Structures are given as C-alpha cells and as structure tokens.
Nucleic acid binder design. Sequence first.
RNA 1: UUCGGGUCUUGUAAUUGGAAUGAGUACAAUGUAAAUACCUUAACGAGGAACAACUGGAGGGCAAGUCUGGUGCCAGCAGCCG
RNA 2: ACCCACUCGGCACCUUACGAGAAAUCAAAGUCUUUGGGUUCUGGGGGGAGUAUGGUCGCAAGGCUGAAACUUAAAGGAAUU
Lengths: 25, 96, 144, 182, 53, 217
Amino acid sequence: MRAKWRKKRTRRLKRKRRKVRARSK
Amino acid sequence: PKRELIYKEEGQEYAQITKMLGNGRVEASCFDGNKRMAHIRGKLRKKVWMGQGDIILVSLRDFQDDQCDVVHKYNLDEARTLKNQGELPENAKINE
Amino acid sequence: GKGKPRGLNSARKLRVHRRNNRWAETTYKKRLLGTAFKSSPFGGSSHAKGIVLEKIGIESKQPNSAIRKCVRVQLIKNGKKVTAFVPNDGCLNFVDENDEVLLAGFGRKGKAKGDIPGVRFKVVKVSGVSLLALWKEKKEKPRS
Amino acid sequence: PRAPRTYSKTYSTPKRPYESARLDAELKLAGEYGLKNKREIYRISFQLSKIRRAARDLLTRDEKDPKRLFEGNALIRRLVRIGVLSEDKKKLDYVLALKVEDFLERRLQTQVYKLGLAKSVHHARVLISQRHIAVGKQIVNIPSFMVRLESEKHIDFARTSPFGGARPGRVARKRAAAAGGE
Amino acid sequence: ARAGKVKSQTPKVEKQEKPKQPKGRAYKRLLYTRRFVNVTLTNGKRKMNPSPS
Amino acid sequence: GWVPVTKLGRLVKAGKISSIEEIFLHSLPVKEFQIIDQLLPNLKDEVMNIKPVQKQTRAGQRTRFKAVVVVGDSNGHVGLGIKTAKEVAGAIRAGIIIAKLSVIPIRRGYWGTNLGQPHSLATKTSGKCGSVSVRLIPAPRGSGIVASPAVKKLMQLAGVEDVYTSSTGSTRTLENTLKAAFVAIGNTYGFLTPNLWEVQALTPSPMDVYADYATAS
RNA sequence: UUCGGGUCUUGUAAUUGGAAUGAGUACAAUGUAAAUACCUUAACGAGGAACAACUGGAGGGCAAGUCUGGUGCCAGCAGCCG
RNA sequence: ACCCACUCGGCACCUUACGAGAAAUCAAAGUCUUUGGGUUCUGGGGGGAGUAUGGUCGCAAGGCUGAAACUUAAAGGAAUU
Ligand SMILES: [Mg+2]
Ligand SMILES: [Mg+2]
Ligand SMILES: [Mg+2]
Ligand SMILES: [Mg+2]
Ligand SMILES: [Mg+2]
C-alpha cells in the first residue's frame, strides 16, 4: 500500500473523529 | 480404482460444512444439534478441497465444545452411502 | 568532530543529551515509565497464581501445525484473563477446571513463545504440585 | 547484628560452558591429580588469577618505588613458601606467567604420591580422607591442602591409624576376633 | 485422546538392573581412562558415543 | 616429484637459502608452493570451517566449498588460505597450499620489560576486512589468548601465548574475521618502534647473489 | 623360513580375595549457662541386592546418537533456527 | 573582443586511489581501534504509528510536539548468481 494513500485515509479518519467530537459537544 | 471411507469412533462425529470463514477455520454444523467453529487439520490443507457445503468427520475436543477439528472429508458417493446406512438425517445434498 | 561537544565545560549538555537519548532504548524506558506495574498481566513478578477458568486448545502459528492445549487463566492479584500454556504430553488430565494454578513466564521477556499465538505464560505448579512432577510421577496429585 | 560474617564465593566458572579443547584439558588435569570436581581446577585457577591480578597491579606502577617493591616482594615470598614458585624465579614477571599445573602439583593430594606412601593419586586421596597422613602431627584430611615446602619434609603416616603402626584396623580387628573363637 | 495420546499409548520399558556408575572422583577417573589413556580406536576424528555397526 | 619453476624455487632446491627470514628480508614472491614446505618443516595446518557456497542456474544450484585454512608453527609464521572448490578434501588441500604460499612473520614482543622470550605482540595493532576490525593488544605474561575461537586458533598457530583482542564488526562471518586478524598480524611488521631507528645495511638479494645457480640451463 | 614365549608394559569382564574407612549408631568425656552438634574415641560399622546421586541435555548454536522400540504435520518438542 | 600564462572566488566535471566505505561509490562520505579541531540537531529491530491523548499555533483543512498497550524474527541496505 502507498504511504501517501495511507496518510490520506488517516487524515480522513481524524476528520471523522473531529466531527464526532463536535457532535458530542 | 476407488477409495474407501473410515467410520467414526467416539467423540469423533460426522458433520456438514455450512460457511467458509477463512484461514483454515470453517464454521461447521454438526448433526448432533449445535453449530461449531472447526479447524482444518494439517493433512487436509494439502490436497483436500471443499465447496459450498460437504460432509465431514470432525473430532470434537475433550475440553472445548464450540471449537473442534475436521479430521476427514467425504465425497458425494460416500455421503450417499452414509445416508443409506442411517447415520445422518436425509437432507445432505451435493451440487456444483 | 561529530555531535557531542568534545568540549570541557560542556558537560551539562552531554548529560542532558544522554538522558534524552536513553528513552529510545526499550528496557530503560520500561524500567522508568513503570510498564511493569501498570501493564503486562503479572505485577512485574516472576510467578503468579491464577485460576483455571477454561481450557482452550489454541491452534498454532504457521509452518507448524497442532493444537496447543492452553488455559485461559484469571489471575488473582490483578484480575486479568491471560492464556497460560501447559507443557508436555496432555497434562490437562492434571489441570481440570476451576483449579488454582501457578504460572511462570516463558523465556521471552514477556512477548510470545515459539509458535503459540496470543500466549505468554507456562503453567508450573497446578494446585501446588508442579506439572513436571505430576507428569514424571515423582510426586502425585492431592486427590481433588 | 553483631557484624556480618564475610563470605567469598571464591571458586569461579569460565565465561563459556563448552569449548571442547578447554574441557578436554581440564579433564586431563583432573585425571592427572585425581580431582572430585571441576571446581577444584576452577578453584586453583581462581587463586592463581587473584595472584596474577595482584602482579599486574604491581607491574604497571614503576618498580624501584614503594608498593610494587614491598607488596610484590611479599607476594613472591608467599609463593616460594607454598612451593609453587621456584627459587630460580623471584622477579614478579615469572609470577605473572605460571599455570594451574604448578599449583595442583603442590597440594597434599600429590605430595603423598610424590613421597610414595600410597602410590596412585586416587589412592593418596583415599588415604588423606581416611585420617592417615599428617603434615606435622596435625592430621590432614584436605586433599587441596597445599604443602608449604618447609613442612613437606614431614608428610609421614599418622601417629594413629594402620599403615603407620597403631592398631589392626577395624576390619583386621574383626577378623582377629573371628579367628579367636576357633 | 487428544490430550496426551503418545504418553498413554507407548509401551512401558523399565530401567534395566545395572551395576552402579561409580560416582565422585571415580566417574572422572573412568572418563579419563576412556578419553586420554586407553583411547578409542584411531580413524582420524574421534567419537565419544559410537553407534554399533 | 619436485621440479622448480621460478628462480627462487631453483635456488631453494640448490640449498643456498637456509631459512625464510632471509626471503622475508627482501620481500620475495613465493608463487611456488614447495618452498615453504622445504624451509619450514614445522608447519601445523588447521582447517577452520567449510561453508557450502551456492550459485544459481536454470536447473538446481552449484554447491562449492569455501574452506578457511590456517597454517603455522610456534615460531611466528602464519598462513591463511581461502579456497572454493567443488570437492571438499581437494578444496582443503588447495587452501593449505595457498596458506603455505602466503605465510607471514610476526614481530612477537614484550608485554612490558624483556625478561625471557617474546610471546606477545609489539604494539596495539589492528586490521579491518569487509567490516570486521580485529584489534589486538599486547597482553602480559600468562594472561593467555583472549580471543574468539577462530582468532584464538590463529594466535596459537602463530606462537603467541598472550594477546587481548577487540574484535568488532560482524565477526560471525568467520572468513572475514580471519582475514582481518591476518592483516593485523601483517601490520605488526610495519609499526616503526624506536628499536627500529637504527640504520640497516640493505643486503643484496639472494636473487642478485646466487644468480648463476638460478635460471634454467 | 609359518608360528611363537608374552618374555617388557596396558586396559577390560556378573567373576573371586584380603586391606582401609566415616556416614551411621553411639559408654564416658568434653564442649555448655544448662543441654544438643563439632573435635577427640571405647565396643558396634560395606560385599553391587549394598552405606543405592542427581539434575539437565545428545540437529545446530554447544559437549554429547544419521542407536533400539512406538507416534505418524497427530500427539508433543523447540530460549531462536526449527 | 579574442589568445597564452597565471591567479583568487564559485558551479560542476574526468581520471586515478596511494585513503574511505558494508558495498554502490566518495578528493570527500578522506586525515577513525594509529579512535580527541569547534559546535547544532536527529536515530536506536520492524509493525502498531506520525496513530491515541494532552498541550499548543491555525477562521478551518491542519502543523509542531508525540505515547503506550499490544504485536512479530525479521523489516531493511548494497551488491551477486
Ligand atoms: Mg538423565
Ligand atoms: Mg526431555
Ligand atoms: Mg533421547
Ligand atoms: Mg556438537
Ligand atoms: Mg523504533
């Protein structure tokens, strides 16, 4: 697996997490 | 030229393949009643190859019930012979 | 001259640098953070007694094939559910269910041994008789 | 809580278990002088090692000056007294050399077999164990006794015990008693 | 039984009635005799424990 | 059978060179094997290890046998031969030959003060081959060979009694370690001591003296 | 000339002999603050079955088995390689 | 404006290695077991993971810092067939 792609996916996951946190707040 | 079947002993019990989980672990349905998470023994990963559902012999462990070990594979002819004998209820079907 | 001030009044920088560097070495880190007390089932002890909850034959790692005759053990002191392997020729004929069992490490400074996946400990003293003794019949089980 | 009694794990292993040649050599040594355990050879080596360490310590510091002259001299004296060191060699560099073979050939173990008495090293050992052999009139049952050269001229059979004229000997006595009734 | 078949299947052969392998210094002596005195028959490279053939 | 090629071989056969010290003095090539055997009859030759060595083909592989051979005495001459042949015994023989050709001197020296006979090295001196640095270090009397097995054996062959070694780099590739050790030993005869400021004569070589007996008739 | 005596020295074998013992038990005596134990010692103590040495190993690392039976990718081993 | 001989400063390059380096290669990656010119900073088997949490600096996307639990005998380099 490409490293760049992995990083992108991680970023997406992070974003999702942030969104979830916001919702919780 | 044709092969011959090996009959069960005690604890070692006939069963059917229901679903392919993976890795060498197959969720098999035993005709005793309960469904089990079975392991394909080393000799069988070599040549023995299953499909969507076949008839098997499975050694059921002395200390665990839900996990067990697939010892032997049965063919269509073998299955029919078993049915004739009366070890299994008449529901086992072979089609590919 | 490479890194380190080969200086003379240099020493604090050197010492601090060493301190900072050390943390990347695993053993030292473990000692300092105190990984022994917070984690790794045993209390940083050699042996721990636990209780035979359920006997499980764990299906071994690759090239090798077999079932590995381990025990899910709930430790008394921490209350952690480990899987302790049991040595030699069955000897679950000694272990049974709901027994007190003394466990050891495996030789691998924690971690995993040989080919058994998700396993960390040997069993030694079952009920207070030691597995080896039971197996070689040098001493025998206290009835029930 | 009076004081701690000072121990010393003296007699010390080699840093690898099995280098075949080493093992063979040690076995040969044991065979030569009849040693119950590798420990004995190891013991001797450790003692020699201590001496060697001391010698090394002395040597690095320039001789003609005090500690080297004095301590070194004392060490030399000690070694000549034990008999291990030879009177030819009183230079400290000679001390630095040496062998286990020098020490083993100076125990009361062999000083029996050299002076005759039993003849065969194992026999000598047996004799020493069985309260035959005194160094003075003080009886010795230490195989690795290390005979102090000037008291070597006194390794004779015990004042008590058979072989050295005292009594028949507890089996001989029994036989005599048996004979008596006939 | 899956739990320890080859221990509860293999035939029992007892330890034979033997003369004592003489302990202490004696064993060492014996070893010495075997290895550096009597000497096992020369071929080139020596063997401590030969299989009979 | 003997039969010499090269001038030096011929000279040796005539028996006008007594010992290899003279040869060493004039740094003479010894391409002919027999010479060393003739001059040093005291050669104790040891095999180290014979790792199989592979080469890949369309079908199967080529298993050659790289055998490390040491050669020595107690006098301070050591050989090192590496050979890779298909037949193992043959390979060993070849290695032996190579080692004999190689054979090199050692400036055995004093630990600290002269006393009696040199069984150490002169100087802390090192080699490095591949990435294995064998350092050796003049140990004092009786303090033995302090070395890993291979190196220890080499030292024994040399006729060194006392040596510390700092073997560093991946010493587990035995061949490389051995080579490094050999290099270090060679180096001994390079470190100009003050025992060496003294001006030499520079002798005319055996090649330039016994010239008429040399060369084919 | 075909040996041989085994003249000189070595080991090995359930064989068979006479000699040593302390570990044991133990009279006293010491030892002790009484007493144990040691150090002395009367008498009694050894004939492989006795007065009985284990622990771990023998693919390699690393000394030591391409022995003899069973198991047959199972049991199980193996600190890694296996 | 060329031309020839220099000469500092640079951007590089070509041969040799007498040195390195594991090697590929390098006039520096040299002057390092014969180890010491002065200094910053960074690394400690691979995964987990540039993750989680906490700080922070961002209008956000994010950045700087940054774990461990687990988990595995390899993951790597540079050459060769
Ligand atoms: Mg054993
Ligand atoms: Mg075992
Ligand atoms: Mg075995
Ligand atoms: Mg070995
Ligand atoms: Mg890391």
